[PDB]
Design a protein. Structure first.
Lengths: 487, 484, 487, 62
């Protein structure tokens, strides 16, 4: 009771389960990659190329397959981009492992070489990585450009990448990490894609509570009140209005409802107010302007008020919304991501998400590597010669580890249309002795080109995390010989 | 009615059932051993290498298999480490037994030799065991290091083993046993593993009026409610706690708002609605009695802690009941990144505390890595030579079964289990080494005493006696009656 | 309607049913005998070697098999030990019977010889039985030693047998039967087996109610109160305590609760008291010391108080318990049977049960016979020569009765490992002419030895009851030719 | 073991001795074979396999 496989029947059951889900996302990789449509129990339709979003929301029930969905889940959590690459490598590491298992090379000699090779792969990637001075904006634009590319060449326009770099370099808390939560993302409509602007303000989908109040305010000290400013019919709000005036706040964002009596008194003072702003927008206003959300009107302080640079009720795209925005030295930045349809906007929103990560990782690390399966060949040849200096049966585990690294450049040709056998030799011979280190496959051109001059560059964290997450997972999976599954 | 197997069909049914569960945990043994994932009815997932935790929580229904889950259950209860080794030996003793049963050698002649060999095995392990002075801290560090190793080489760091020895040598009540309950285990978060420094109740104080940290506190554990109305009916209840002389009060039920003022008026600190699991922890750690009546609360029913403090550790404000100085009680703040890591680092110390505590109580250690298994095997085969009768073959099969552990160590290492089994066997003859064993990382046969691979004598002596007595009883069954 | 077997199909149906349950308990016999595990409908597990406990609690449904579970049931009721032997003999008497039935020798000629042989077997056992008169303690120790042996050689220790004889010889109501109910059995834990003590006494699992009270008293008068000595806060117990002092009882056993006020006053007088003693222990204290159970304090008498020799709160085996010991002439004796685990204690409790029976039977009867299948050979050869002096077809029934007696010494070799065909000749030839009468098989030695010098002896009632109970049952079963089973 | 013992320079004459077990120098052991044993065996096997890899249709009568 109830389900058990013995030795050889258990090892092959776990390896096959990891490989079968790897082939599901193997076509998606590359600029010439494919998309997947997922229809669940509800009949809800969603089409995505992103490898991590496929594995999470589809029906998977095999115990061994569920353990491999933790690799991509920790890939999107740590890096973001390279979720597809982290899964495919893990599948090839299982394919090269079972070839050794059939020859009676023991799993612990395999795990001995696999760990030692991954330990050397991390210290070899550091030497081949290029340094991009944290504020080297011309390279940071290329890194951002490489991130937008892959999701679409038409999405990759010169002006878009220049906007993203300016936002990330500003939110750096010296010295000197990058917080991704400091950048606010707004999804609004209107004929755009090109009208996407780099913004200084939360965009609140609301108006002014009274038409008597000013349409625009200068240098607004913003009081974020969570508490209700409410009443009857006997001016019981003149205290509540004066308490806000005591702090010196000319703009008031209220999360709850503002009563009609208070609307007149706040308009008489000259204070602009808004009733029932979304809880999501209130948390944005607190971090962007530097404000504190206060849940009591009697204790509202002047040092709990935020500072904005432009507050205006513009009738943009027809809808009259409150522009907060605009800042001399902003530690928080808002991105007004706009497009024709909401489904386009959400895609342009997720495209920036990857572009923010890579530039943020470059500032924190220093470090980029050549993409398009370029550094995968350099690391592969450097670990095979590293295997030569290893005596024993653990050498063959390092050899299988290095031969598994050539799967990414091989799959990039599989989805491109070109032969995966011919190019795999062309790039391999173009890495020997000295040059290039930066030689890779360009899927549009066809011939092997220098990736440094093309503008195809990825952060070092995209490659270092993907290898370590796949190695640690495959090492654990090769340590299972008995499976106990109840029910 | 309802199920019965006859003679040969009953003996083979019981032997096969014991062997089939032995192979389930046979791959887990060794530094390069395998792990097991168990998915039960609820869909709850847990991965473990520990042999005893697998057999307890998995679905086992065969009558003969359930009897062998009492060997490892009494292995973790008596020793702790060596739960895997105790099961594998019992499986090999059944394999070597049925080889004799098919040759028409009577089971009582088998049980005659098996007991006589186990009686000799216990009086042969005593010589090959090395004496470890109770406060020889350089060897005690090695014993602790050998305990952490096996669960992970990355877990085995030089600084960790030095911390453990200092705690165990301090809690020794002269003279001169070691109480494992004196060491308090705390599970907290924070970027640690290395920040691990030499009861934690998830609650606060019932009133902000009450103070925060005493020295030499007396703790009254009350199960009964301290409750009321609006006419100071708690002034008796508060004074009855003051009558005993307890400045700290842990209440399992609810404390009423009127009593909160009066307890804080005296200076007594109270906590309302502490979990039943935590109340049983506080009673055994401090030495307290759980009292279910406020009228009979005595001063000798109170526990004694060293340091009680409401620290805001990891954000959460919790009651730190530990502590001391020149200390008969020690607290271990076991910390790590995720809670699942912390619990594993907590269980790794559990084995490390046991071995050092056993070394102080006994004196005694034996070489690990399948080293003393070969020495005992060759000494019992020559012991079999001086036995006349058919009971000799039972002693020979008993001694040949002892070479299973060194054989399985090579099975999971990668090296040949047939080649090394000869190399070590030849390196034990005449005199040297007695301490010769297999090092899975090096590959070649090395001296285990110089490598630092040492285990307490109780790990080997208990495992043999628990496996021998179980297999002796299992070979005494010829008819099985299973109703329903 | 509904079930019936005709003649030959009915006789063979009943004989086979008696033999199949006999083989179930056939392997349990002997010092190297096997144990049986019984799993019922509830899933309750219990392992036992004792033959009578197996047959009672296991699922048996055949009509002929249920009638044979009355032999062992009346064996444990009359004797105690020899429940296994009584069943195996009955099975062999059915095997030797159907060999005669297939040869067309009529059942009434079979029952004619079977009764006549059993009538002679009883008068031949009396001549071969050895006399050890009722208080011959050196032989009584051997009889007790022989009873403990069979359940375990490690259980058979010199000191244990000496303790049992002293208890049985004391509870004899002159003149001069032995009541087995007079010996109280207590099952308590602690590192023992050797710490098992003879109590003319009760061992109460409790302490003193107040630490102010004395710890050891000589010639103590014990008042057994069943009523509660209780109160408020106005010394309403000074009457109750003085009423205890009015009788003259320095020791006080209370079944209910003693109030805290009374605890001080009883300690002031010097009277030792205990609160909430188990009802089982209170009935023990009343019969051992010679006390009365007392419920309503107001009437306390000196002639209801029991008399003990030594009352001491010893911290034996860690636990501090009240040692009520040292009676002078006890007609009732308590045995504090102790061991490590409760499952060990229960086995050491049942081992004494057989040891009490045999010594009690020796005092009531006078006799012992040699065990280990020794007297079974002597009676077998003496009945074959008795068969020679019988003319007719009833002779073959006596011959089959005598040939069936050699099953016990044969089965003793079966479970020993030695050949059951070779030894069966060795002992048979060693009984001819004169010697030995006390020659039998020692399973540990292997060779045939004199059982009288070895110390292997069993009471005559163990053999005489087992033969008569098996003979009368088999005689009735051979008288059935039609079976009517409804439903 | 032998593959790593051929790198850079030495040995060229390193091989496996089946009786000893460990890798030994074959020149000092006395294990030597003529060049024609190796040169003929390669050329005879290469020319045969080259011809066999040139067949895509098989006609077998009877
Ligand atoms: N123009 C290009 N020419 C060649 N390779 C490219 C080009 N643009 C991107 N790549 C490479 O294609 C890979 C990215 O392919 P994708 O299909 O986006 O998968 P992924 O980035 O691994 O995972 P996602 O994006 O999270 S789904 C990286 O290895 C890039 O270096
Ligand atoms: N470095 C080492 N070299 C060789 N043998 C070792 C080494 N460290 C430990 N051992 C041996 O490995 C065995 C311990 O293996 P484990 O897999 O931990 O199983 P166990 O201790 O029998 O049971 P657990 O720990 O309770 S699961 C002992 O027989 C040790 O003596
Ligand atoms: N040391 C011994 N050597 C030879 N025979 C022995 C020895 N001890 C006991 N016996 C015999 O073994 C038989 C007792 O075996 P047991 O298995 O205890 O069965 P039983 O007494 O018939 O039934 P139980 O005890 O009620 S289950 C008797 O016939 C004894 O005379």
């Amino acid at each position: 009771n109830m389900k058990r496989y013995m030795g050889r029947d258990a090892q092959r059951m776990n390896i096959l389960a990891g490989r079968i889900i790897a082939e599901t996302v193997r076509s998606t990789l590359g600029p010439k990659g494919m998309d997947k449509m997922l229809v669940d129990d509800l009949g809800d339709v969603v089409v995505t190329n992103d490898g991590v979003t496929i594995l999470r929301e589809m029906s998977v029930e095999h115990p061994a397959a569920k353990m491999l969905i933790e690799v991509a889940k920790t890939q999107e959590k740590e890096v973001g981009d390279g979720t597809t690459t982290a899964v495919v490598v893990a599948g090839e590491l299982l394919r090269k492992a079972e070839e050794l298992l059939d020859q009676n090379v023991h799993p612990t000699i395999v795990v001995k070489g696999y760990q030692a090779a991954a330990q050397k792969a991390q210290e070899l990637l550091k030497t081949i990585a290029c340094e991009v001075g944290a504020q080297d904006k011309e390279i940071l634009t290329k890194i951002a450009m490489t991130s937008i590319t892959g999701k679409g060449a038409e999405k990759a326009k010169e002006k878009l990448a220049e906007i993203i770099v300016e936002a990330v370099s500003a939110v750096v808390d010296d010295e000197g990490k990058v917080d991704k939560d400091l950048i606010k993302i707004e999804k609004k409509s209107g004929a755009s894609i090109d009208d996407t602007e780099l913004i200084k303000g939360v965009l609140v989908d609301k108006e002014r509570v009274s038409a008597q109040m000013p349409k625009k305010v200068t240098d607004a000290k913003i009081a974020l009140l969570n508490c209700a400013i409410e009443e009857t019919a006997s001016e019981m709000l003149k205290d509540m209005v004066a308490e806000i005036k005591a702090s010196g706040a000319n703009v008031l964002f209220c999360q709850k409802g503002i009563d009609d009596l208070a609307q007149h008194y706040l308009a008489k003072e000259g204070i602009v107010a808004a009733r029932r702003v979304k809880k999501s927008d209130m948390e944005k206003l607190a971090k962007a302007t530097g404000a504190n959300v206060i849940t009591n009107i009697k204790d509202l302080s002047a040092q709990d008020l935020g500072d904005a640079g432009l507050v205006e009720e513009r009738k943009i795209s027809g809808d009259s919304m409150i522009f907060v925005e605009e800042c001399k030295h902003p530690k928080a930045v808002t991105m007004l991501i706009r497009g024709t349809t909401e489904h386009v906007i959400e895609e342009v929103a997720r495209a920036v998400d990857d572009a923010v990560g890579v530039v943020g990782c470059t500032i924190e690390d220093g470090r980029i590597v050549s993409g398009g399966g370029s550094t995968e060949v350099e690391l592969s040849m450097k670990l095979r010669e590293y295997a030569e200096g290893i005596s024993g049966r653990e050498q063959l585990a390092v050899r299988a580890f290095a031969d598994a690294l050539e799967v990414i450049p091989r799959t990039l040709a599989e989805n491109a249309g070109l032969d995966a056998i011919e190019i795999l030799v062309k790039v391999r011979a173009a890495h020997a002795s000295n040059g290039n280190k930066c030689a890779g496959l360009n899927v549009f051109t066809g011939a092997v080109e220098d990736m440094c001059e093309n503008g195809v560059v990825e952060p070092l964290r995209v490659k270092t995390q993907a290898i370590q997450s796949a190695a640690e997972s495959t090492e654990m999976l090769l340590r299972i010989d008995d499976v106990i599954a109840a029910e």
